Design an enzyme around this catalytic site. Structure first.
Site, mmCIF file in Angstrom:
data_model
loop_
_atom_site.group_PDB
_atom_site.id
_atom_site.type_symbol
_atom_site.label_atom_id
_atom_site.label_comp_id
_atom_site.label_asym_id
_atom_site.label_seq_id
_atom_site.Cartn_x
_atom_site.Cartn_y
_atom_site.Cartn_z
ATOM 1 N N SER A 1 0.607 -1.385 0.051
ATOM 2 C CA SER A 1 0.072 -0.158 -0.035
ATOM 3 C C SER A 1 0.707 1.111 -0.176
ATOM 4 C CB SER A 1 -1.050 -0.128 1.053
ATOM 5 O OG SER A 1 -2.223 -0.597 0.799
ATOM 6 N N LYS B 1 0.330 3.881 -3.055
ATOM 7 C CA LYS B 1 -0.704 4.852 -2.954
ATOM 8 C C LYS B 1 -0.305 6.232 -3.143
ATOM 9 C CE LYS B 1 -3.754 0.982 -1.566
ATOM 10 N NZ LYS B 1 -4.479 0.301 -0.387
ATOM 11 N N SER C 1 -6.363 3.638 2.975
ATOM 12 C CA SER C 1 -5.592 2.699 2.410
ATOM 13 C C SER C 1 -6.824 1.706 1.300
ATOM 14 C CB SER C 1 -4.783 1.601 3.069
ATOM 15 O OG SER C 1 -3.677 1.317 2.412
ATOM 16 N N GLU D 1 -4.498 -3.777 -7.578
ATOM 17 C CA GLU D 1 -5.109 -4.267 -6.247
ATOM 18 C C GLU D 1 -6.008 -5.390 -6.518
ATOM 19 O OE1 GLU D 1 -4.225 -3.930 -3.109
ATOM 20 O OE2 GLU D 1 -3.236 -1.783 -3.396
ATOM 21 N N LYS E 1 2.327 6.664 5.450
ATOM 22 C CA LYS E 1 1.639 5.405 4.618
ATOM 23 C C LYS E 1 2.127 4.185 4.958
ATOM 24 C CE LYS E 1 -1.399 4.159 2.238
ATOM 25 N NZ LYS E 1 -2.093 3.076 3.197
ATOM 26 N N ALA F 1 1.117 -3.619 3.957
ATOM 27 C CA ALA F 1 1.238 -4.955 4.534
ATOM 28 C C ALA F 1 0.937 -6.179 3.414
ATOM 29 C CB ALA F 1 0.466 -5.364 6.043
#
Length: 263
Positions: free
Chosen positions: A45, A48, A105, A141, A209, A212
């Site tokens: 993440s 982003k 997120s 994603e 930010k 995981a």
């Protein structure tokens, strides 16, 4: 500081994973500390932030408007879309998508934003054009979070991510207004409480930010500093382990505590 390096190495042991680490001076860009700076890790993440950096870049060039409203359907919803799943009817503005992607997120928001710029290829192109020939995004994603060992897809380097975050937050790459909007979104990060934030004392500024994976990898990029202002960039990535989520976080927190103590 040497005592932090010791904490990083101790984190590798407790985690049973490799840890990338780097501290950059926000103004000079000078490297203050590092460990495995040139090694690759999956961004997860943390990408982003780069994505909205690219979106803001287009806004600056008159090729996008933070106010544009985007409509989508159920079929666009991927796992963990806390904000977007609540707007299948009315839609969301680019501005709201960046907020959701960075502060919550939100995964669908990230994909919708990827679609506006032309997908993974374009984000990588954007990075390439600004001088980052290392970082790369290849998938959407959730696939970009596989984190298959040695797979170089959707990866970056502590050093590359750090310098890129810095150019995004302080250079002239983005306009003053865009620069400010990006860091405001990061400062409002709501899902990185047990990481660097749990060691940040009151009065300190932090914009970050985190990311995981299912295999246990963990990451976080941040601009922080005392007296309510950011003066340093910190990037941390790990290769995944079987330690509990709480144990993984604790290690990041301890690195942060050492970072603060020896500021």
């Amino acid at each position: 500081h040497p005592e932090t390096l010791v904490k990083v190495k101790d984190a590798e042991d407790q985690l049973g994973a490799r840890v990338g680490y780097i501290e950059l001076d926000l103004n000079s860009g000078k490297i203050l500390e590092s460990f495995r700076p040139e090694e690759r890790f999956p961004m997860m993440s943390t990408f982003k932030v780069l994505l909205c950096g690219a979106v803001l870049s287009r806004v600056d060039a008159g090729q996008e408007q933070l106010g544009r409203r985007i409509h989508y359907s159920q079929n666009d919803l991927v796992k963990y879309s806390p904000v977007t799943e609540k707007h299948l009817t009315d839609g969301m503005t680019v501005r709201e998508l960046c907020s959701a992607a960075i502060t919550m997120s939100d995964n669908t928001a990230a994909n919708l934003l990827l679609t506006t710029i032309g997908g993974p290829k374009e984000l990588t192109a954007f990075l390439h054009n600004m001088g980052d020939h290392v970082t790369r995004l290849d998938r959407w994603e959730p696939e970009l979070n596989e984190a298959i060992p040695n797979d170089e897809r959707d990866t970056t380097t502590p050093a590359a991510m750090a310098t890129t975050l810095r150019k995004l937050l302080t250079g002239e790459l983005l306009t003053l207004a865009s620069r400010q909007q990006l860091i405001d979104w990061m400062e409002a990060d709501k899902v990185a409480g047990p990481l660097l934030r749990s060691a940040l004392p009151a009065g300190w500024f932090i914009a970050d930010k985190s990311g995981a994976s299912e295999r246990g990898s963990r990451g976080i990029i941040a601009a922080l500093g005392p007296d309510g202002k950011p003066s340093r960039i910190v990037v941390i990535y790990t290769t995944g382990s079987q330690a509990t989520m709480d144990e993984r976080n604790r290690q990041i927190a301890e690195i942060g505590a050492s970072l603060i103590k020896h500021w």
